[PDB]
Design a protein around this ligand. Structure first.
Ligand SMILES: *[C@@H]1O[C@H](CO)[C@@H](O[C@@H]2O[C@H](CO)[C@@H](O)[C@H](O)[C@H]2NC(C)=O)[C@H](O)[C@H]1NC(C)=O
Ligand SMILES: *[C@@H]1O[C@H](CO)[C@@H](O[C@@H]2O[C@H](CO)[C@@H](O)[C@H](O)[C@H]2NC(C)=O)[C@H](O)[C@H]1NC(C)=O
Ligand SMILES: *[C@@H]1O[C@H](CO)[C@@H](O[C@@H]2O[C@H](CO)[C@@H](O)[C@H](O)[C@H]2NC(C)=O)[C@H](O)[C@H]1NC(C)=O
Ligand SMILES: *[C@@H]1O[C@H](CO)[C@@H](O[C@@H]2O[C@H](CO)[C@@H](O)[C@H](O)[C@H]2NC(C)=O)[C@H](O)[C@H]1NC(C)=O
Ligand SMILES: *[C@@H]1O[C@H](CO)[C@@H](O)[C@H](O)[C@H]1NC(C)=O
Ligand SMILES: *[C@@H]1O[C@H](CO)[C@@H](O)[C@H](O)[C@H]1NC(C)=O
Ligand SMILES: *[C@@H]1O[C@H](CO)[C@@H](O)[C@H](O)[C@H]1NC(C)=O
Ligand SMILES: *[C@@H]1O[C@H](CO)[C@@H](O)[C@H](O)[C@H]1NC(C)=O
Ligand SMILES: *[C@@H]1O[C@H](CO)[C@@H](O)[C@H](O)[C@H]1NC(C)=O
Ligand SMILES: *[C@@H]1O[C@H](CO)[C@@H](O)[C@H](O)[C@H]1NC(C)=O
Ligand SMILES: *[C@@H]1O[C@H](CO)[C@@H](O)[C@H](O)[C@H]1NC(C)=O
Ligand SMILES: *[C@@H]1O[C@H](CO)[C@@H](O)[C@H](O)[C@H]1NC(C)=O
Ligand SMILES: *[C@@H]1O[C@H](CO)[C@@H](O)[C@H](O)[C@H]1NC(C)=O
Ligand SMILES: *[C@@H]1O[C@H](CO)[C@@H](O)[C@H](O)[C@H]1NC(C)=O
Lengths: 162, 192, 216, 94
């Protein structure tokens, strides 16, 4: 009369009246996200829906990570500014959704008898930032869990040495 | 860290199934025989919240220690000395670095040697002189069209091909790509 | 008594390391109870237990996208192998991409990939695997055409025949031996490349970290 | 590097020496009362004749004043062997 895919989850029920097996799937859901270029930079925002067929959510552009509203697809590829997912990124032109640009494609001149040797050098200082410690914090037991209450702390002792 | 401390405070306001979020009210208007029932759910909820905070703190402590150990390692090699290993401290050929104090960490200034202004030359891997294959002790062979020169791989410092800065091995037939050229010898002018 | 080698064997060793996992995201309002307004009321009165959990989960979800960033995106620009491939007798078609494959995947990568509901959702990775091979292709071109020069600054071309000579010079071996044994080295390298692909073609349980990480 | 579904795969090209032969050696050579040391590599001998070669490959070469440097005396260092050191300038002078 019905079927379970895995982990005790029904995914197929046959209606006995009609005698025709039908698949069952949970309908669309997920987390809605907002794409913005910055409060001071601009005001327009674009709404993103994750893993939803873009036919019942409400410029609409469908992408591999669901469809987003408020951006226009651009064939031209630029450097990624806002990472949305599935290889698309958004930035400010209006909000534009474009395929991520991996980088500048250059074919260096290669040959069996060609050596590129620098004739000049530039010394540049690079700043690396690394944390080594965090704020030292301590939490008390009796006066926090209950607080200046002997009767309450008495029941706390029953839990042992947690 | 600030939010982890802050989010813990709000947990005190949660009833965790009790009727009030403050202990005094529970001790006030509850019959003591059954008063502990509301307390017990309250303590478990608060204890669970306290358990989570410590666990999250422990996870961050391990991450900080890993970063701290990495920071110490960078200081060990790139500050106390020169890091031969490539791109371990600043992009480019690292020379040295200067640590700087930070409120909860350390900031380095990796002094790197970035080459630029490159030129391409027609070259060969070896030179044949009098039937003997010559190789460079250091650097590579280069030629500005006609004249040949030897320079280090990281800077253009052309020099005359000389016996002193080259070594011979084998014959002219075993290596491919060789070019025919004359190797200067400083002894001949001195002898003559 | 001194024992000195009179010959050398060049062997390629495969090291497997994971760099990212599935970006998982978990809801709580529709997971703990599920489309139940009356039940959701008792969910929130516990406080903000699941509010931080999503923040904690999404906190690591973006980390994997970061993790892939430094491990792969280490090239300021994308390099392309020259159309003519004469690397002093070396063969690299196994690792380089081919048009026959999906326009970016190499023969070994294809061999590697082939060998490998309500309440939950999975976030797709920021860098799709299709263009992940693009970074490796760029690195392959840089480490072959430009050798180690492009790692420091601008990519400087260097013929592969004498690029090995520096590396041989870097392990206390005079470069003269390499040129005298260039043909032998190329044959050894090609055989090693051919052998490693066969070591994983039919059957191989050495996937280890890559294969098992999905399991847990 | 090679792409993997959830990781990265390397192909470490390594230089593994093989076909090793054992030879009698000395740490230095005494020539005309001067202790000679190799600029690089170590001294080797195929029984009688002595040679200089690098530590990672057998490339014997004639002991020459240019591939060796002199320091100290013949007495302070132990294990030295008595042998002659060729000089490239003498044939040119003669
Ligand atoms: C190497 O590069 C440096 C700068 O990167 C050059 O120095 C410049 O020289 C010009 C020549 O008049 C000056 O106008 C600039 O002010 C200099 N800049 C700096 C920062 O010093 C140098 O000339 C270059 N040398 C070669 C041989 O190319
Ligand atoms: C440089 O030297 C080589 C080596 O001798 C020369 O190659 C010779 O070329 C002639 C004419 O083709 C042949 O008869 C010889 O047999 C070659 N030598 C060997 C060892 O095979 C070459 O011609 C010289 N000049 C240049 C520009 O390379
Ligand atoms: C160093 O070892 C290689 C192989 O490890 C030797 O190459 C072999 O040479 C024989 C001689 O005819 C051939 O039959 C084999 O087919 C070669 N094998 C390979 C893989 O090329 C080489 O001769 C050795 N060299 C020395 C000096 O011992
Ligand atoms: C190599 O040179 C050494 C150093 O001169 C020689 O040792 C000398 O041996 C004679 C005879 O046994 C002694 O009279 C000398 O006093 C020794 N020299 C010193 C500095 O004490 C050695 O004989 C030579 N030959 C060999 C094979 O080692
Ligand atoms: C029972 O099956 C008959 C056969 O076609 C169909 O006409 C009828 O509608 C069915 N009744 C129900 C209640 O499904
Ligand atoms: C918005 O604020 C950022 C951060 O200070 C600044 O870099 C940017 O220039 C600002 N833009 C405008 C339009 O004010
Ligand atoms: C979304 O659903 C429509 C049918 O309503 C279908 O034609 C389309 O292919 C679906 N899109 C995706 C990405 O599956
Ligand atoms: C972009 O690509 C699509 C798909 O091939 C094509 O239909 C369209 O004309 C192209 N140009 C623009 C401006 O969208
Ligand atoms: C290589 O050098 C030649 C010299 O004539 C030049 O024409 C060519 O443009 C150079 N290639 C480069 C810089 O890629
Ligand atoms: C190359 O450099 C030499 C060195 O002085 C110079 O004499 C010559 O004119 C330059 N050009 C050519 C084509 O050799
Ligand atoms: C270098 O390459 C050119 C063109 O590919 C070829 O004509 C020449 O024979 C090659 N020489 C060597 C030494 O590889
Ligand atoms: C590299 O190996 C493949 C494997 O069959 C072969 O088809 C190709 O011709 C080889 N290329 C070279 C340059 O040896
Ligand atoms: C050692 O090598 C030399 C080098 O030619 C050779 O003359 C000699 O016969 C070899 N054997 C001995 C025992 O010296
Ligand atoms: C090396 O060891 C042997 C055997 O113990 C000994 O006869 C000889 O004198 C030693 N020589 C040196 C230089 O240590």
């Amino acid at each position: 009369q019905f079927g379970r895919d895995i982990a005790d989850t029904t995914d197929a029920v046959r209606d006995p009246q009609t005698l025709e097996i039908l698949d069952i799937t949970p309908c669309s859901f997920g987390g809605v996200s907002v794409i913005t270029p910055g409060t001071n930079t601009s005001n327009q925002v674009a709404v993103l829906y994750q893993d939803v067929n873009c036919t019942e959510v409400p410029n609409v552009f469908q992408t591999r990570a669901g469809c987003l509203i408020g951006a226009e697809h651009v064939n031209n590829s630029y450097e990624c500014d806002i990472p949305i997912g599935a290889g698309i990124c958004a930035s400010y032109q209006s909000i534009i959704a474009y395929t991520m640009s991996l980088g500048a494609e250059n074919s260096v001149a290669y040959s069996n008898n060609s050596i590129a040797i620098p004739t000049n050098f530039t010394i540049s200082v690079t700043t690396e930032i690394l944390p080594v410690s965090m704020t030292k914090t301590s939490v008390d037991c009796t006066m926090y869990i209950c607080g200046d209450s002997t009767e309450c702390s008495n029941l706390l002792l029953q839990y042992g040495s947690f | 860290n600030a939010q982890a401390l802050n989010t813990l405070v709000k947990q005190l306001s949660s009833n965790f199934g009790a009727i009030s979020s403050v202990l005094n009210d529970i001790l006030s208007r509850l019959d003591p025989p059954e008063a502990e029932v509301q307390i017990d759910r309250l303590i478990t909820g608060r204890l669970q919240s306290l358990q989570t905070y410590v666990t999250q703190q422990l996870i961050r402590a391990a991450e900080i220690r890993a970063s701290a150990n990495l920071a110490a390692t960078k200081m060990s090699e790139c500050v106390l000395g020169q890091s031969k290993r490539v791109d371990f401290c600043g992009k480019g050929y690292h020379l040295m670095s200067f640590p700087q104090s930070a409120p909860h960490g350390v900031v380095f200034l990796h002094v790197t040697y970035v080459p630029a202004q490159e030129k391409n030359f027609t070259t060969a891997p070896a030179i044949c002189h009098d039937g003997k294959a010559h190789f460079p002790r250091e650097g590579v062979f280069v030629s500005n069209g006609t004249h040949w020169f030897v320079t280090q791989r990281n800077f253009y410092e052309p020099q005359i091909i000389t016996t002193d800065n080259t070594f011979v091995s084998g014959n002219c037939d075993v290596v491919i790509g060789i070019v025919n050229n004359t190797v200067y010898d400083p002894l001949q002018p001195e002898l003559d | 008594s001194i024992a000195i080698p009179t010959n050398f064997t060049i062997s390629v060793t495969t090291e497997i390391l994971p760099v990212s996992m599935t970006k998982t995201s978990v809801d709580c309002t529709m997971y703990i109870c599920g489309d139940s307004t009356e039940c959701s009321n008792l969910l929130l009165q516990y406080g903000s237990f699941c509010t931080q959990l999503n923040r904690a989960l999404t906190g690591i979800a973006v980390e994997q996208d970061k993790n892939t960033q430094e491990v792969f995106a280490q090239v300021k620009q994308i390099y392309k192998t020259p159309p003519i491939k004469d690397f002093g007798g070396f063969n690299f078609s196994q690792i380089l991409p081919d048009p026959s494959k999906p326009s970016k995947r190499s023969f070994i990568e294809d061999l590697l990939f082939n060998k490998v509901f309500n309440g939950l959702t999975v976030l797709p990775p920021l860098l799709t695997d299709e263009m992940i091979a693009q970074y490796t292709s760029a690195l392959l071109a840089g480490t072959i055409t430009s050798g180690w020069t492009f790692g420091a600054g601008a990519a400087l071309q260097i013929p592969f025949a004498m690029q090995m000579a520096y590396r041989f010079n870097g392990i206390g071996v005079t470069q003269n031996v390499l040129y005298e044994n260039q043909k032998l080295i190329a044959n050894q390298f090609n055989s090693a490349i051919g052998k490693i692909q066969d070591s994983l073609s039919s059957t191989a349980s050495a996937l280890g970290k890559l294969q098992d990480v999905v399991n847990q």
